[PDB]
């Protein structure tokens, strides 16, 4: 008969999912953001430019103000319209002569007399072109496109766990278990050797695996605990949908008190830990202790949840069980984010190198 | 006594191995293949070369055909024999004047008058040398040598699972369990507190852990299932070797219906999940539920497989249990492939950068 | 009642921790050490330098000996004191004329007449500055600072497992279980539904989960084994602290015979495998099979260890359970080491590229 602790294995696997939800899943990768360095190189290039070049960025009446493109259109016989936004950004602080002199000092160009500035300028223009080619590389934008957001990933995880964008509070306000489709009795709600459950997410699966009910507190209702049953008071033969208080008495078996470092490997391990616990039969697969007939919560029956989507003849969880597919999508997105973070560290180092060289007066003359 | 579901833990661990076999393990890493970019840079270098240089690649009678190295030997006083294959490859389409002009346009060199082409040529020759130095780096060939193939990895995984290069079909055609050495009774086949099993791979270990037999369908034979026993009909006291139909009734408990993304971490976790389930005793270690004496399939004995290779005094699975060592070899190969993929993305980005610069007419003049 | 094999799940999880200790955890990452290449580039730069430059590194009396900085101070009107150590290192072998000629040959500079050496020198000085900028990048020292040592990581792991810098020998010499605080009886030592254990590390937790004692050899004392109980002889109602012989009879259930490749993912998986096995109650969480009251080792009570630090209302193991926090610290340090190894492969490849170019006579003239 099913008794105390018989579902500890399954509880652990499902809580490894639950604990990811809320805002607890964290992208601690940070990001290689090299825009600061690129902007500095472009500003250094403008600072070293011939004064008639910086003069193109000035208003013809107030030389301290930026050129307006209606008042002074960019000549059609140039490619200046393709490059103006970045040029004007680099020029804007330099329109102030005192700021231009301050930047000349910041970039180690203020000791240069005209012919020596001309020489350095050639090297700076070359380094600047190389910086743009490295940082504007379509592959850089490719990696940047594969960068995910903690908010987006957290939303998808809460969809897998709760079918909501956010984790329900401790009263489960706004949440209805089994999407309002619970009926009849525990075995109808949780499934059997022939029928699937009414669960659509990981939380409600955990509830079927771990909740006690009115009839099994002395025996099977202790399957996920030690000494004392959860005490849900669930009476599904009379009132099929458990209340929020009931759900929380099961969720509190899981660690909602810490954080998890999001990595594809971590998600993969957690999904496999559930997926291979599914006991594949002819018509359903069962998660949880099962002895006979159905997941009715009786000690001679089962404390479990059943799925028709995978059996001993078909189906993989990450494709065919919706909540698990949703979580596998997070693993996929994380793998791409991880590859992008690695790739983007290269232009970051390269831009730092170029800025070091561009600020080295001896190299520029060389 | 051993009964329904008592081996779910062990089944899950072993199915995490089985599911890797067949063609289901996938190298989704793809590869940084930068040959296209290197070839383009070399062709651009040849396109910009002085016409007497491209003329070295022509047949002396038909200037549209490539030079034959018997007819017109490469002068011994040059190093041209060290470089000819790559040069001739770059020159071949350019021997056609219309194609040479088309390539001049493709690479943004067709607007250049002779003295301006000479200037650009100097920069192109420098960028081309840098491209070769980055992409021919012995460390690039080092990483390329550490690139593995999905086919090779899949073969090794099937060796660990089945002792075959490929996964047996659903009738297990061509396969003999226990390599033909099964004899006597279940406990001789599967092992005991004193003797190791006759299994040599992961499939036949799973069979010992999970198969029902003629004597235990009502009790221990349900150790890996829910309601209904596998129904192998195995009668090892009479006919020791199980048939292919019998083997499949156990393999279908595992997910052979999806795919797994090959990573060293994923293999490592799956091996550890088996290895630390081995219950280490004085003379053998046991995988599966064991109560007394041996792995005979009796509910008072064990549903299990035994190994002499590791005990409470010696042995690590990834070195001393052959099937597990074979799988650990895949983890090792995957770790190197992963490091190589990371390293090779650097020359890929660098070559894209160089091609961007080489096609920028303003940079070339700079 | 708790009987044979009921704690195999928990044993496996805890042995996945124990097996990391000793010297068995291995940083097989190796390291990108590019100092050899940087030193060679700096020596090549000095080899190609004008002879009056190399003469600055000579003693004024014995031209074969290095300049002494008291005898011949570095002029205050230069920045030579900022660069001398690396310059003198590059110059030292070259003070010997025969060695200078040998290095000229090694670096492919010995065929160069004076005007051709002048041309090559310009390129070498430029490549050398680029090498320093790439390898002296503050981000390189940042990554190098995030490089961990196998010795440091191994020490922290032994602290989590044993509260010692090193793994106790097979007699547990120098080690006292429960830090000398064991008293009264097994349930006082190991904890209950209301009180935490006296364990302070992972080894002593494993002992509470897996040791037999004088009263349970026929039943609960077989929870972590197959046929034969560990045979500790522990009599905690009389002598509370187990002896070293007793401890070893439990540790030998774990794999202390192999090695583990240190990775953050591997540590993360092993911690989660323990943490989510903790059965969270109102006042304690329990690791191990528990039926009633306490972890007394009785078959009707529990074979387990209890923690007050996490419950169904608070606490995450990697922050609030000291031994687990200590191991989580290793995961954190490993993640940074892994990111640093990846980042540092970039300057390594770049320096190899530069050395290839600097040794290419045709490129230098270009
Ligand atoms: C770092 O800082 C440097 C400055 O130090 C900055 O350099 C500037 O780069 C831009 C972009 O490369 C240069 O833009 C060119 O500007 C010339 C000059 O235009 C003025 O003068 C002409 C002649 O008197 C006037 O006609 C014109 O109205 C302007 O007043 C333009 O002539 C260039 O346009 C031609 O080339 C483009 C390609 O680059 C074509 O797209 C365009 O259609 C033009 O081509 C036509 O003329 C060609 C003649 O040879 C002909 O071959 C074509 O077929 C076609 O008919 C171009 O816009 C600008 O001069 C640079 N500034 C200086 C002072 O040198 C860098 O941009 C900066 N780096 C970064 C990364 O920001
Ligand atoms: C990008 O595109 C460029 C072209 O724009 C291309 O450049 C070519 O590079 C190759 C390889 O560096 C150059 O090859 C050299 O060719 C000369 C010329 O040979 C002809 O003319 C001589 C003189 O009349 C004849 O004797 C000869 O038979 C040929 O007709 C050779 O002289 C060079 O060989 C010497 O140097 C080699 C080292 O590079 C030695 O290995 C070789 O033994 C030779 O050395 C001898 O002479 C030296 C004299 O100084 C002496 O010092 C040595 O001790 C020894 O006695 C060499 O083969 C070729 O000229 C370039 N082409 C042009 C038009 O400039 C790039 O290769 C391409 N980039 C890439 C990456 O593909
Ligand atoms: C690869 O190999 C090359 C050699 O091939 C090597 O190059 C050497 O680099 C160093 C560092 O850049 C150069 O150091 C400079 O040396 C000059 C020369 O000093 C002598 O001669 C002067 C004049 O007769 C004497 O006064 C002096 O006592 C020495 O005898 C110094 O003048 C330089 O110092 C000035 O510039 C520094 C900035 O680099 C300032 O920090 C310093 O205060 C000095 O500035 C003063 O003078 C300036 C005059 O223009 C003025 O503008 C300032 O405001 C200030 O008043 C400097 O120390 C050395 O010359 C190079 N060697 C050669 C032969 O060219 C590379 O270092 C090597 N690469 C690597 C990576 O190792
Ligand atoms: C589960 O199985 C038991 C035993 O057959 C049965 O009594 C229950 O009614 C069923 O739900
Ligand atoms: C396994 O153990 C049981 C109980 O001792 C025994 O009856 C069987 O014969 C043996 O194979
Ligand atoms: C553990 O629980 C059993 C059953 O109530 C009790 O008999 C023991 O004394 C206790 O330690």
Author numbering:
A (entry chain A), B (entry chain A), C (entry chain A): 24 to 389
Article, verbatim:
The mature VSG proteins are attached to the cell surface by a GPI-anchor, and consist of two main regions: (1) a large, N-terminal domain (NTD) of roughly 300–400 amino acids that is most distal to the membrane and (2) a smaller, membrane-proximal C-terminal domain (CTD) spanning 80–120 amino acids beneath the NTD that harbors the GPI-anchor. Therefore, at the heart of antigenic variation in the African trypanosome are the NTDs of the VSGs. These large subdomains are elongated folds centered on a three-helix bundle scaffold.
VSG11 and VSG615 are related to VSG3 (the topologically-similar class of monomer/trimers with O-linked glycan PTMs), denoted as class B or N4 in the literature. NTD structures of VSG11 and VSG615 were solved to 1.23Å and 3.2Å resolution, respectively. Both reveal a fold similar to VSG3 as well as the presence of O-linked glycans on the top surface of the protein–one observed on VSG11 and two on VSG615. In addition, alignments of the VSG11WT-Iodine crystal form with the VSG11WT-Oil form show that the second helix of the three-helix bundle displays a significant conformational change in the region near the middle of the bundle, the helix becoming disordered and forming a random coil in one monomer while keeping helical structure in the other.
